Structure formats: C-alpha cells, structure tokens
Amino acid sequence: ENIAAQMVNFDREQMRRIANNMPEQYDEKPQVQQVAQIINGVFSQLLATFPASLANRDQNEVNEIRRQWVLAFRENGITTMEQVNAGMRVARRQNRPFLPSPGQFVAWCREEASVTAGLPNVSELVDMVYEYCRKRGLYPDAESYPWKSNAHYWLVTNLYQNMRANALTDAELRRKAADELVHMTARINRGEAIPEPVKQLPVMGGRPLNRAQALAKIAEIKAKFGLKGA
Amino acid sequence: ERDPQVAGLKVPPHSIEAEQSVLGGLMLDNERWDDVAERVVADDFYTRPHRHIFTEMARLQESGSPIDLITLAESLERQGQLDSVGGFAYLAELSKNTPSAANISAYADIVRERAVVREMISVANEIAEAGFDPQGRTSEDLLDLAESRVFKIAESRANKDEGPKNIADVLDATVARIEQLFQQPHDGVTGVNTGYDDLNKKTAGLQPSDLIIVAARPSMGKTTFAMNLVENAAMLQDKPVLIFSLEMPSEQIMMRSLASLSRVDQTKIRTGQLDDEDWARISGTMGILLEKRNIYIDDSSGLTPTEVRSRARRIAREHGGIGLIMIDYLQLMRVPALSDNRTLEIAEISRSLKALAKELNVPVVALSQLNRSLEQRADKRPVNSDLRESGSIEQDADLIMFIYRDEVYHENSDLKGIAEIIIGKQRNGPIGTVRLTFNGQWSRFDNYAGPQY
Amino acid sequence: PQVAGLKVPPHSIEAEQSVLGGLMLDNERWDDVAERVVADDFYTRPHRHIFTEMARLQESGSPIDLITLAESLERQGQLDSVGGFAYLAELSKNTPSAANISAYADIVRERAVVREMISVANEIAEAGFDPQGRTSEDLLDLAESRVFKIAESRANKDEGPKNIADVLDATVARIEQLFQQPHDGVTGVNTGYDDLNKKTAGLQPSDLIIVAARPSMGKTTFAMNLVENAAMLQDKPVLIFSLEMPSEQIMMRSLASLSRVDQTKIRTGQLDDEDWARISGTMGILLEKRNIYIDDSSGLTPTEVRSRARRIAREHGGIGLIMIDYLQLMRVPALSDNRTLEIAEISRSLKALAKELNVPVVALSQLNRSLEQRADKRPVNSDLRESGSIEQDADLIMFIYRDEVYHENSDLKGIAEIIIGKQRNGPIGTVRLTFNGQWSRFDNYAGPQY
C-alpha cells in the first residue's frame, strides 16, 4: 500500500490516532555477568562434590567444559539459583564419582523441581500413561477413569492425545512427559486453579416395560395409523 | 472413424484443458499475465483460435488496455476477427467453464511442454523426409538444414535472458556507465546516496544490483538505521522505495519515520503530549512526503521470495522502476518446500534475494540476526562467523555491515551515543569502521562531528 | 524400381562392387581409396568384412589380390561368412579394370552421411515418442547434441563404439598437431603463467577444472585473469557465465587488470591522462580481437548453459574456454528438494559439456566454514563438503589461499598460493603468484624459489 493513503487517514483522524497512540514498554534482558557468576558457582560446587573429575587435566579442557555448560544452561534456561540447589541435592544423592553431563544435571534439576510441586516424576507419569492406554477402553469416558487428582487427569489425557495424534515413540513420549511436568509445575508455582474436568451428560434410564405391553403398544399404533403392511 | 486408439496416436501431443484454463485465468485475472507471458508463447497453442486470442491479449496488454472478457470481445469485434475465433459464445464458454481460482503456472508449463515435444517430432519427420528426397541437395546442405531446423526449436524467445553478448556491447555499456557517473558530481557517491559522509566515502553509496546485509544484536538501532537509510534514499532520489515489514506494523514504522524526520521526541508522540510546534513540524514533514509520495510499505507476514519478487515487479511496472528495497528481517521469510532444513531455507532465501537485486538493478538491504554467543566473547564487535547457520549469506552478500554500540553492553562506555558500522565484507572496496552519532531520543543516526583518528 | 516416390536408404551396391574389384585388380590405388571411404560406409556385412580384411593386409605389408585375400580369409574361417571364393571371383571379374575408383569411392561416401542423418532423425523421433521420464528440456538437449555432433567433420556415425583403427588415427593426429606448434611445454590453452604451465601443461580440452577458495580470496579475479590470458593468447571465443556479478563490474575489473590502472579510479571515473591512454589502448586491443562473450543471467540450469555454449560454438566454429562463477548458484528445478543430487547433476552435466564441446570448462566453487577452525587453513579436498561428486568428477582442482586474509601480520603479503588438490594426468603441488589487488590481477612470482 502507498504511504499517501495512510497519511491522508492520519490527517483526517489526527486525534483519533493519538487516542490509538503507540504501545509502550521496551525489552529488558539480564546481563551476561549474572549468568557467568551462576556458571562459576555451579562449577565450583560440582568440583567440591566431585574433586576427582578434573584431576590430571589442563586449563584448556576445563575452559571447554565450562563453555559447554554455559551453552547447555543457556539453551535449557537455567536462571534461578533454586534449580541449581535442587540439582546439587540430586547430585549429592547420586553415587557416580565422575562429573555428570550438563544435560543430566538439567534433567536432575527439572525432576527435583517437579517432585517438589507434589507431582509424579517422569517414570511414574509414563507408567500411568501406559496403564491408561491399556485400561481406558473399559470405561465410557476419560472422566470415568479412577483419577487420583486433576493434575493426573490433565497430564495423562494430554500425553495420550499427543502420543496417538503424533505417533510418538517411547523416547519422544518421555521427552513430552518431561515437558508436560515442567509446564504443570510452572503453572502450580504460579498459583492457578486446576479445572475439574468437563463431564458429559447424565445417564437417565427408568424403562420398566415388558414384552406383552410393548406388543400391545405396537398393535395400538398399527390400529391408530392403519399400517396395513406391518 | 472406427478407431479406439489406432488412429489416436497420429495426433501430436497437446492439452486443450491447459490452454482453456490459462485463457480463462487471464480473462478473470489480469495480474498474473506476466507469469503467463514468461512461460508460454502464442506459437505454443495448438489451435488457431487460441493463438489468435493470446496474440490479441498480448497486444491489449502492451497497449495498456484491460484484457477482461468484455474488452477482449469488443477489440476482436472491431477488427472483425470475432467470427474467426469462434464467437462471443465461445469466449464466454472459455471465461465461465474455466475457474478463476486456479494455478495457471502449471497449465502454462503443460502447454509449453507439449509444444516442444510436438515441434521436435515434426522436425525429425521433416529431416527424415528431406533425407529420403534429396532433390539435388548435397550432404553438407542437408546437414546444415537439419542443424538449423533442430536449433530453431529452442530459439524464438521474445525477450527472456538475452544470453551471451559480444564484448562490443558490454564495452559500450561500461563506457555509458562511466560517462553517466562522471556527468553527475556527487563528491564520490556513484549510487544511491545514504546521507552520511564517511559511509559514502567508504562505500560510494549503495550500488545497484548488490546484496546488502545489515546485522546487529537486539536493541542496537538496526531497524532505526535501516529506516534512516530508507528516508535518506527517498529524500535524495526520485525513484520509488519499497519496504517489507514482517515484524512491526506499518503504523508504527510511519510514526517512527515522522519522529525521525521532524526530530520530535518519540516519548511525547507515543504519549500524545504534543504542542503547536510539534504539530507544525509533523505537518511540514507530511507536506514533504505528499510532495514526494515515493514510499511504499507492505506489512504481510511469512512472505515467500516469489511473492516479494512479484510485488516488486508489479511496483516497478506501475511506477517505472525502483530505487531501493528494504527487508526486515530475512529470518522471518518462509520457504514451504525447505521448511524441514533451516540451512537450505536460508540459502534459498539469500540466493533469491541476490537474484532479485541483480534482476531489478536496485540495492536490496536485508536485516539479519546474530548469534548469542557473541555476547560471551571478550570483544562483542560482530564478525562474519557470528552469522552462524547462514554461511550462504556471507558467501552471497556484496556488502555486510554490523551495527555496534558499546553503550548497550557497557554503562560507563567512553563512546556513549557513538555507534560503529563495521564493514565485514566490502566486495568492491576496503573494509573498516565508520563512526556515527545515535540519538535514540529522536531515533536517528547523524554524522560524527567529533575528531576522527 | 521405378524410384517415383520410393523411400529407400541411400546406397549403391554397384559402387561398392566396383571399388572392391578395382582394389583387387590394382593394389596401388589403395591410398586413393583409403582417403575417401571407411569400412563403416559400406551397407552390407560382406563388403565391410572384405574392406576391413584388405585394410589389415595392406597395413601389414601384404598384397590384397584375389588369391592372397581368399587365403587370408580362409585361415580365419571368415571366407564362408563373406560369401565365398565364388563371390570374390565375381567381384574381381565383373568390375572392369578400366574404372575411375575415385568417383565410386566418393559415392560410397556421403550416401552413408545421408543414411546417418536419417538414423539420427529416427532416433530423435523415437526418443520424442517415449520420453521414459525425460523432461522436454532434456529431449531438446539430446536432439541438439546429436545434430551438432553429426555435423562436425562427419568422421563416423553420430556416436557409438569405434574400431581401434579410427581411434589410433585420431591419437596420431593429436600427437602430430601438438608437435606442429612449439609452445614450450604447453599442449592446451595457455594460462599466462609459467609455473602454472609447468604444473599443468595448460588447460586441457575435455577436462573439468574446479577453482575453490574461501570468500574474499580472489576466485573471480583469478578466473577473469585466466579468461583474459586465454583470449589474448588464442583465437577461439571465450565464454563467461557470471551468475553473481553484472557484466559492467566485470568489465571494469577487466579494464583495471589489462590496462594496469587502479580499480577505484576507474570505478569513480577519476583518471589522469596516462590512465585514459592505457584504457584507450586496452579497449582498442579488445575491439580488435572481439572473442570474449559474457552472460550475466542468474539462476541458470545446466541445460541452458550447455545450450548457449553449443550455440556459441555453432556460430563461431569452436570455443577456447568456458568459465562459470559459480556453481553453487545454479539451479536444477526437478532436484530442488535434495541439494546433493542437484550438485551431482550439475557436476555431471558440466563434465558432459566439456567432453562434448572439446573445451576446457572452469567452474568456481565455495568451501565450508569449518576450514577456518583448523590449525592450518589451507584448503583440502574434504573442504568441498556437500560436493563429493565434485571431487570425484573433476579432472583438475585448484585452491586459492592468501595468508594475509587470515593474518594481518603475515610475512607473505601479496603472495597467493594455488594448491593443486587433484590432477588426473599430472603431479600436484603449490604454485606461488603475486596478487595485485589494486589492479585486480595475478602475476608471476619473481621472488626466490626453493
């Protein structure tokens, strides 16, 4: 479109577009210094936990490992120190002398955060999904399933629908379960109220009719409407 | 008859349905004509009425008249050729039975292919028939005749990729270019002027048919600098300037342009806290723009290179050329076929942009994003390798400029308010850093009046 | 045989019988017949067999009279297949000695040419009727290639297996031609550089040549210098396909290189009197020669490039060199989905074009970013990533390396290295040149050599 039309509209409206005005607020981002300090603290605490990990290694390998950890944390979004503390607790629970991979540490942090929010971990969620996939054909609807809590219902139904629609494999199912757990934990930590399904209609019933009365009704209908063929 | 298929293979290959679809699409849509014109010719049509219709439509298109059903029928009626074609009844049948909402490119290609195959078969038949009946011709004459007949098939193109040219024509064109450049003293600006002295010194303006990439980290004035260049090009040149905005709407761009041109604080305009002087400045700017009226903006999202090229061609046809093209930004452009691989999509986008720039003989400035790892380096001034996932962008770009502000990363920067344009790849000149002054309050770039080292 | 509209392949049995009988009766005129007709020109198997046996006997130093020919045929068991001593005696007797075998040999001539032309037309029609997955462009390219090959020196049929006699004649002709023109170690197109000529003996015809380097190393400069040297040192046309730059910028670079004038002055038009004189001399020489053609179309398919090269060779009777800059910008629409297949098709088509036109084809290519992360940044073959078929199909591969590009404090400023990564018919190594970017030129390195 030509600028002339917009300018003519601006001249015709003037104060109307001033009422429209322009959205405010800009973009603010954290500095690299905070991320560097977080990475240094994580590295120091891990070296304290696993002193033998960097034994017999030059500074170049240490710098490369630090760069890899920085990249992994930036990709996975490690900002709060509470996640770092949870990961350190999980690592102190772990019994492997060697230094864990950054992805494993991120998984530990996410798993501990999910467990803190009163939700099952990835393995329990996957087992529940498998049990649901085996047993849900025996119930009239998803709301008739014996659900423990609303979070279980939503997680299981969402994972089942996603898996059936996208033909997910086992590893893809586990990754989706981890993502769903992260999202549900984030929602729970933000307060929020989990809805109580939707339900679908009552069952009705109450049909106390026998064979003889039904035959009498059919005969009466035939007599009234003159259905000679029947 | 008495022929299911025994006499059905004397018929040369053809497709009536594709011809009718193309003619109907042209009748019910006159915007796609060029797409039809670049794929089919009047001699690709098997039936005389279709050739006549296509020729008349081409004549009307060249004369500027619309090529709808009514106008075409009237034009044929005046020349007395309506009866020969098949009548207004046949014209209406073609217009109606053939849908408007169709892809005419496929039918045009189908029409093109059958004509080539049929002409090749006919030429082979003629060659064999001449061979069996020499009629006094020698072997050399027959071979020359066969060669001419065979190569006359791929020939007969109206005007499309004229091909190799003798050194004489290219030398004449180069002499004409040199004379035209010298006849206009612009103090070393042999191209689209940018309005900045040092930038014009280092780059000699924005040369036509070049791919120009502007790259910067978020919050660096990349969009502001691009808009300043667009405004300078529009003010200093009379050719139209086209803008593609895949991120911000056109209204915000217009408000930013008004603020930059009138040097009115953006906060007051965004809050509506203006006064009489601001109104006078805005009115003067709008009067100047109405005097020019050489800027066009398209704010569609997810634009493919084909749509961009088509719209640029349409604008050039409507207003006799383009002065500059601006795209913000290239990463938002989508290639449906290469959506699976990002690198191939980026390479296709860069190649299409370079091809468009070369075709239109206009400078095309596309905006790009850098990698976040740049922020982790000791020096945050961008380099070419900071264009990761876009090696083809570095390869195919004539000019690459990085916008840098040390004030963004350093609060106590000694160069506060000073921005650097770093020339990563200057194809036809030297490389270096050009210093400018950045006014984010007015959202503008100005010449650096301070001392230069 | 009224011959009032009959469609019969052109042939004359009487001429063949007369030629064979005359050669039987007088073996001395064999040379006068050997320059006018070949075995393949004969229409029947017995006549071809007889002519081949006579040629073998004559080039083995033996008479080709009736008795000797029959005895030689009998020893190989092929006398019965020919037709027998009865048919040989009939050939010897029926044809009179007092004959002019030159006219008959010229008759067993071009009739075969017309028959070959009819065969080519039939092949074109048959290919048109049954595409077998071929597009229209492929069919047109095939037809053009066939009709172009048939109309060049007419040595034999369009294409097919050839007896080793014809190939040996061609090889001896090639040796004699390469020895008739002393170029001091250059048997192909001269590159204008002595060390490169020593390494490669010129740009050989029918070879695929790849020039590769990282961006800003000077691929276009080196290629244009090769084009200019080929044009100045030869008479055949030189064709340029520039999908990356307009022809005007290329011409400005060429003027800067040839006239040795600063490129910035030419681009900005600010020249002194001596610069104008040099430019005038260069333009005069270029307009005197007139054998450089430039095509700056973008997104060319291999079919279009081959067709345009074929048209140029058809118009001017041959090509001296073809240059493409560069191959990563070419398009194969049917294979747009897969890049590897597209690159393989481009490389194969370029090699086929080089073989067909008997011309050197130099195509430019780009390398991968990972090269910049190695300890030594000099290119290797594996740096042709996505283009393994390029490494497999290229007759010659040259990489351009300037150390000053990566090292500002490099001690080798102005010195470029041409590294031969692959040479099918020669050695490999590094050739040093002087890079004058001011004039956009490469020159012979005058420094000391180890």
Ligand SMILES: Nc1ncnc2c1ncn2[C@@H]1O[C@H](COP(=O)(O)OP(=O)(O)O)[C@@H](O)[C@H]1O
């Ligand atoms: N009204 C304003 N007042 C002061 N500074 C501004 C204003 N608007 C934009 N800026 C500055 O301009 C810079 C670039 O903004 P913008 O052009 O939107 O982003 P980009 O750098 O991606 O082009 C920002 O860093 C911001 O500080």
Ligand SMILES: Nc1ncnc2c1ncn2[C@@H]1O[C@H](COP(=O)(O)OP(=O)(O)O)[C@@H](O)[C@H]1O
């Ligand atoms: N006016 C000039 N003066 C000196 N050197 C130049 C000039 N213009 C270009 N160059 C040099 O040419 C080189 C690249 O040329 P070119 O061959 O076009 O690059 P590519 O290798 O991508 O083809 C650059 O390294 C640059 O140093």
Ligand SMILES: [Mg+2]
């Ligand atoms: Mg922006």
Ligand SMILES: [Mg+2]
């Ligand atoms: Mg180049």
